[PDB]
Write a protein that binds this ligand. Structure first.
Ligand SMILES: COc1cc(-c2cc(C(C)=O)n3ccccc23)cc(OC)c1Cn1ccnc1
Ligand SMILES: COc1cc(-c2cc(C(C)=O)n3ccccc23)cc(OC)c1Cn1ccnc1
Lengths: 105, 105
């Protein structure tokens, strides 16, 4: 169904994150106080399961989570950091990838 | 190409580092003061080129670089950190992989 289209989009984005910083949830162990600051955590790992269980109706629900993942990254980490810089790149990239016009292909 | 047992050893270790923390040089941007503390930096990226140019004579030359990479990691980073813990895992793994007895094969 539309699950297949999301898996195409997901694999496009996972490839843009070669070091897998967005691969499973961030822990307080590696990110002090992450759980207190980000109350809506999101990751490709979580977005994979939600395609496996067809819990995505629209594209717009998928990109909502995708944006939440990048906003979390740009909210917890300083602009100086690898996690911030990669978040902004991936956010702007995915939005042009899953856009109104490019969806017509 | 007689020396490809190094490439066997290398790809065993690279796979133990899925996030690719040992894949190219650490920068002071990512690691404050790295250049001051570690004067002999080493990485799989550097070790790949040195197989491409067959600059490794013995196994013991390869393990020497391998050890330097892990000892750098266990010198610069605190025990608490993911880079330290992965260094000690890879160190104990490579030592059993490239050991006195297993070198018979
Ligand atoms: C998805 O797995 C990881 C994520 C991050 C990571 C990701 C992020 C983000 C997305 O904010 N982050 C923020 C501060 C500190 C670390 C991180 C950093 C990581 O290693 C430095 C890893 C890989 N990891 C986790 C546990 N062992 C390895
Ligand atoms: C090979 O690329 C990386 C290496 C490390 C990393 C590796 C190490 C080591 C092994 O000491 N290290 C020590 C302190 C802080 C970071 C690191 C951490 C990384 O991201 C958090 C990255 C990935 N990276 C670098 C620039 N863009 C992505």
């Amino acid at each position: 169904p539309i699950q297949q289209l999301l898996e195409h989009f997901l694999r496009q984005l996972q490839r843009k994150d070669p070091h897998g910083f967005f691969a499973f949830p961030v822990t307080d162990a590696i990110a002090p106080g992450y759980s207190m600051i980000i109350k809506h955590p999101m990751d490709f790992g979580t977005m994979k399961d939600k395609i496996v269980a067809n819990e995505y109706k629209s594209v717009t629900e998928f990109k909502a989570d995708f944006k939440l993942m990048c906003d979390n990254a740009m909210t917890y980490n300083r602009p100086d950091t690898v996690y911030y810089k990669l978040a902004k790149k991936i956010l702007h990239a995915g939005f042009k990838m899953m856009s109104k016009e490019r969806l017509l292909a």
